[PDB]
Amino acid sequence: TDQEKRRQISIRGIVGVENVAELKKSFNRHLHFTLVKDRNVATTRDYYFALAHTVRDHLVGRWIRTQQHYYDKCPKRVYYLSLEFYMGRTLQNTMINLGLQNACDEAIYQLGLDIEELEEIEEDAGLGNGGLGRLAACFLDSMATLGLAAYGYGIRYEYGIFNQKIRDGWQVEEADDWLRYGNPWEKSRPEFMLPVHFYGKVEHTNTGTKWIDTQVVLALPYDTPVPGYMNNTVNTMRLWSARAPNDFNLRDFNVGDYIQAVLDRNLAENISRVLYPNDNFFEGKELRLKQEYFVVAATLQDIIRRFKASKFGSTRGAGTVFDAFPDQVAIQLNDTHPALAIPELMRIFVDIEKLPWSKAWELTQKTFAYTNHTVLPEALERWPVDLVEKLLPRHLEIIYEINQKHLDRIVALFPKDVDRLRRMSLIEEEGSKRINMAHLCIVGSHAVNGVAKIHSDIVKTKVFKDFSELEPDKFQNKTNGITPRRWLLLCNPGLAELIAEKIGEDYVKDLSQLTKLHSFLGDDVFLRELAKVKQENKLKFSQFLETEYKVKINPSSMFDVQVKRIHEYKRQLLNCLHVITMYNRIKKDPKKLFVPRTVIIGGKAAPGYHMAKMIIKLITSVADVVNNDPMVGSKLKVIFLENYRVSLAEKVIPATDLSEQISTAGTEASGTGNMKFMLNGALTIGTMDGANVEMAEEAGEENLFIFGMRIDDVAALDKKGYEAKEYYEALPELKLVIDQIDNGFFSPKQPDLFKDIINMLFYHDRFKVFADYEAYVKCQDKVSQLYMNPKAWNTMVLKNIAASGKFSSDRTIKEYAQNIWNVEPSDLKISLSN
Amino acid sequence: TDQEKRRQISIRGIVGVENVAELKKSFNRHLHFTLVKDRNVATTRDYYFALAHTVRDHLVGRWIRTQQHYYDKCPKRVYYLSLEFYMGRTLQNTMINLGLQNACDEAIYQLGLDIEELEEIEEDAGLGNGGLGRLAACFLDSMATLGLAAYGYGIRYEYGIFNQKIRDGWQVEEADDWLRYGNPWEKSRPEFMLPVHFYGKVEHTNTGTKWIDTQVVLALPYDTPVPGYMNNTVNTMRLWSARAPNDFNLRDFNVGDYIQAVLDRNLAENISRVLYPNDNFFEGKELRLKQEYFVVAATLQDIIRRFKASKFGSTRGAGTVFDAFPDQVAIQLNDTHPALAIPELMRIFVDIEKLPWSKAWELTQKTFAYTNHTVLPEALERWPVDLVEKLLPRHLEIIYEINQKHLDRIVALFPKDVDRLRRMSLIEEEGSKRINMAHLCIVGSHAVNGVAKIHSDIVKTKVFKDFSELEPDKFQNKTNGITPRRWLLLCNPGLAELIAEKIGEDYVKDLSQLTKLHSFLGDDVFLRELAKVKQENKLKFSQFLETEYKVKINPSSMFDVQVKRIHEYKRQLLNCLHVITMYNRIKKDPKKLFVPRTVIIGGKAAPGYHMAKMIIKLITSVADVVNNDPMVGSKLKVIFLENYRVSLAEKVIPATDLSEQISTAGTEASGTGNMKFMLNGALTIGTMDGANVEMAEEAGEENLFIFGMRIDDVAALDKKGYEAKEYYEALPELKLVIDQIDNGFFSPKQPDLFKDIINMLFYHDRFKVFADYEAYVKCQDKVSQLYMNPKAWNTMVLKNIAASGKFSSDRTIKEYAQNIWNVEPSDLKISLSN
């Protein structure tokens, strides 16, 4: 059942040939044979899927070769654990990284199709929600580009979080059914489903501790290949889908119990139903825990499986096959969501593999590395021990014994320090016992890191003081990055081509090389092209806006964008204050010079966030007024981008001129979007916090439009009293605006509509909108005047783009690989024809 | 969005080349690219799917060409409506009809795989249940072989009916989850879902009658290509799958209503969940109606769609585009299950198309043709008008107005005949109003037919007397048939090759040509080969039995099989009586000559059928005794085939010698299995009823082992009194057997186990087991003695096989095409290279 005849089963011949003739033959086989269609009945969506599958074959051939190489060389594998993967679309990104765009373009042209039309058919993968997930997505691209044997592990959300739609000015959430017509980029593995247990009880027997009487839930993996840039290296993203062990009971169907018959089906599937389910109640709270354990349990079993199966893996040789585990496995804990992976690995090791608790714990710590994204201690994930006790009984035991061994050594260094114990314990004993998941992640990992220089510092010294003191070397910093593939070459082929036409192409895999663009700082002919590229990107986006919004867009306008989640700390209300202000200024009397701007605000509000949704309605109302006002005209146009997401980001970003990063000082750890704009040719107007800080250190604070209170100033005010009533009367323009909002200038049908935004802004604010108002508008006026001089604007732009090179995720990954995972990057190209 | 460049989208190049080199290349592309596997991790199931997809491409290329031809020539299309499609497996049958078996064999051999092993991986399509569905399946193969533009329409049952498993002697039903790993032969059409309404209310407006306030259920079609024999003609079988319009409510998920959120999902999916759901209660009863309407509603919409889209179809030209409808469409109503198609087509025509009721009714009748399978009037499908009124309100109205127009003309021919009205009305007014579905099918069709000569006669004259009298020409006969592809060439390649080695290959598409085998009746050298072929088939099946049952099988044994549904009228209990009898005879004292037999009994019992299940347990108990009895040995072995189905039928049938068709006289209309055995080289022992009748007329009653009471004899006894107590004492051997059963000879642990089979056999029988007992055993002894003389046995066998030619489904289809559908068969081969 083997032989050398079975060597005929290979990709040897069917891999490598990627000319236009073969791409046409493949398109035809997929259109007709895979889709069971023909040119007479085929839809646009069918031609898209035919292109997707054609490209996928090239992708999968390289994935097979990549994985065969990993098995042969048996390197240390990196497993990126994240409850969020903001992947976006896959077609064009795959074509670029595999270098197929040119050929496919010609092929699809010869077939009589419009490739740009096939491309827009694709849905954004409903697998992510924001920056945490997009970081993971950029990391995947980087680890593949850096030749690392890395994996992406998460949950396959059937419906993601939701899609945003704006009807009648307000936000209405829709179910993101991205899978309605299927996903040609994934591949389910029905023959490989892992059991995930829940509830039950512990039974300490003679031959060990047993977790019995449980409810099993199957994890069905879906594999999607992640391609590296031009290196033939394609890695794996494996997402789990919840399924019941027996999705149909025949006995119940014969009795008429049509709900019972498929009862286990629903319960299990709720797990992978949506991303971040409403936790405002036990039911939804318990589901997040189930989702967290689900990813953990299934992922770990898979890792152990592949480990044992590895070349040098398993046996006796091997004394204990797991002695070399941390030398062959590295698991990155993105945030605290997968914190359960620590007790679980311990459960597998001790209960199933029968290894000594002490031996397993040693192995465990060397395996896990924790990443803190949220610097706020009030925002650290906690779980009621009661909830864990019910759902994961054997797991509560392990968290206690882990904690017991943690505290015992603290008194073995602080025998009198009774307060350091309760301050460092995993459990918080109060009128409801909770479990600090960040503490678990810290004690259970060999490394911990923040996402920015000051973020990591606050993490190391402030928040986890009593932890870093015990072991300084554990805490690190890994400043976030962005992939220059999807964020430059893909989204902005114009800029990427201009940059390469001057300094070659080595910048793509070595972004820091962008400093060589300074040798054109004096060149005005280049800056001509540079600004020309931005106008190209602006013409195309203007069309998008006109078609999708039916709003006349001034192409010569500025393009002032602020795209991110709608939240109070993110401000955007402050942006709206300035918008009304510019409107009022125009209303003063025309003729006065006013540099035209296109104020685009985008983002999604949380379902149970009243303030955020009012702010959306507030912006839309302002927009309707200033866009229809005959006086204003092509001077100021306000646009609220509906359903802002990865694909849309790729659209607006290369068309932006002014990046709005105006969050209150002291509320931002990093700023992934900030870096994207910088790289694309936009000037940044933003507070000196989060990402802006390090961007300033690279280009020069002089090159960014820093404004408002610094973190010190805010803490200074959070000691005296922020009475919003003051700035109101003190400031002229502010008064007018605020009044217009409260009197119903922007809401004639319902003047008391924004009544709630007023009361909060004054007597109940928290992020000081008014305190930075005046400071914000003056800063903006400096942007407007700078925008009046092209050379001055572009010279600063080139300064930003030329200093963005360190914000590449390749750099970040090089750091994680070097300082945390102990993995060495590689530039070698996987051979398809070995 | 067209051009002549789009002509590049074609199968021109990728269709036709089917050598071994290309079959290997395709296997590799599917194994690696479709399955995302390699030879290092690929399972047997993966290699199967890779072969299936490879073969499927050849299949789909011909389907595309076939359908493109149908559009071009625009012939009249036949739509076969059946709630059951017993398809079995598809791999090998597809290879034979497309002539790929040879090449694939070599290719798979060069890949180092065992093709027989890949083949057994495939599951039987859980789409059928018995003869009604297998008839439809054979018809599909025949219509494709006969070049007819025919379609198969039904429901895609997610779990079929159930799979049978015998544990501890009894029958236990299991959920037939044939789709667990997917079906590579089907193709869903998510972009084409048809709405199916339920409940609601009627609203007679100004502009027509409206059916409002309904509950929509989506019908998602799954397309599977049905290949014709060596003619490049591949037709379509389209099965509908129930889906909810909105399978997920986000609003409910945020509130924690995890059942509500996916509430509509379950309700809709129950429809296509299982075949023949338990109707013993309103819930299950209402579901069968929903299933019946579901197939109807979706199928008709599809037919209208394709009709309008047809070449000569739609417009004005066309005055009324539907004037030519019955000249372009023919819909066959297999049984009364799809009876709802009559009122529905009327609903579409009148309400939606706005055609005059009279004009629509004319069109309707010319479109439908009804097929009666059940001759019993007590078994005619009836529906409570109350149930229809709730579920399909607009439909009850139409059934009444159809009936009103039916009865009004009866008094316009029988103005005083008050009893003929209530006797011919669609509705039965009683202490619960019911609707006769057969009457609806008759009034709504232009043709009606029985499945056998006497069956159709009883249908024409007895049961539907007052209908045929009104219009004689409506009622016809179409004797059932069997396809010689799956039932000779596929299952018995040995016999098929022997038959062709003497009379060529024209017999495959013209089975009647089998009379030319008589020119070998005197040849003993041929009969040598003939019997050799049966021993070959017997050696292979013996292995199957030993491996699967762990029972030593005597290869020289007879192989006495009776495979069919376990039912009282089917007898098999009578067969068990004889089995015990042969056992007792051996127990008399050894040495006495007893021709060795392998008594194989197979079939499935209905879940709520107590008697049938006892009979299974009865047979198994007998088996355990006579198989373990040291005295008996390789003289008599009893086997009960677990989960008897199409694939198993293909296995045992070519290995049988004695076909048991012993059902009580007057309880069988046809006999599809009977014909299968006859064609394969088995002698038939059976009552003179159903299928045996016409087989006798072809080979000669002299050539079949006719026994027991005739239909006249039984009716003679059903006038005096069948006191089973008589034969009991009167017959020696019977007494012994019956007593052994009642005293617990075959059930020492529970002697009173068969106590219920005794009481029923005596005081509550209905099919006269004892009355035919003596007559049955003597007949059997004649089989045994004949079996002692090879030449005599084979000479009769050749007589059976040589006379089976008329039992081909090609003949039956030729008749339906000629006398009912008004469609002309064709021998022309579809050109792949046009």
Ligand SMILES: Nc1ncnc2c1ncn2[C@@H]1O[C@H](COP(=O)(O)O)[C@@H](O)[C@H]1O
């Ligand atoms: N024993 C092996 N030899 C070679 N390649 C392997 C082996 N096991 C796994 N691979 C490769 O790894 C891919 C992913 O496999 P796994 O790591 O088992 O999930 C497979 O499709 C193979 O291409």
Ligand SMILES: Nc1ncnc2c1ncn2[C@@H]1O[C@H](COP(=O)(O)O)[C@@H](O)[C@H]1O
């Ligand atoms: N307008 C058309 N011209 C040619 N072939 C057609 C056309 N419409 C349908 N067909 C063929 O019929 C197959 C089944 O289509 P339909 O009858 O639309 O279900 C399609 O895949 C085509 O191969």
Ligand SMILES: *Cc1c(COP(=O)(O)O)cnc(C)c1O
């Ligand atoms: C980059 C990106 C983000 C980043 O998160 P912030 O915290 O908002 O910077 C979020 N959403 C999308 C669509 C992005 O592309």
Ligand SMILES: *Cc1c(COP(=O)(O)O)cnc(C)c1O
């Ligand atoms: C042919 C066949 C039948 C035919 O039905 P009967 O009424 O039993 O002759 C039933 N089941 C299978 C598996 C068959 O192949």
Ligand SMILES: OC[C@H]1O[C@H](O)[C@H](O)[C@@H](O)[C@@H]1O
């Ligand atoms: O600015 C984007 C940010 O999005 C999320 O908050 C991530 O957790 C953070 O690491 C990232 O920097």
Ligand SMILES: OC[C@H]1O[C@H](O)[C@H](O)[C@@H](O)[C@@H]1O
């Ligand atoms: O013998 C097989 C029989 O199976 C079913 O009863 C069919 O309805 C009938 O037409 C067929 O003849």
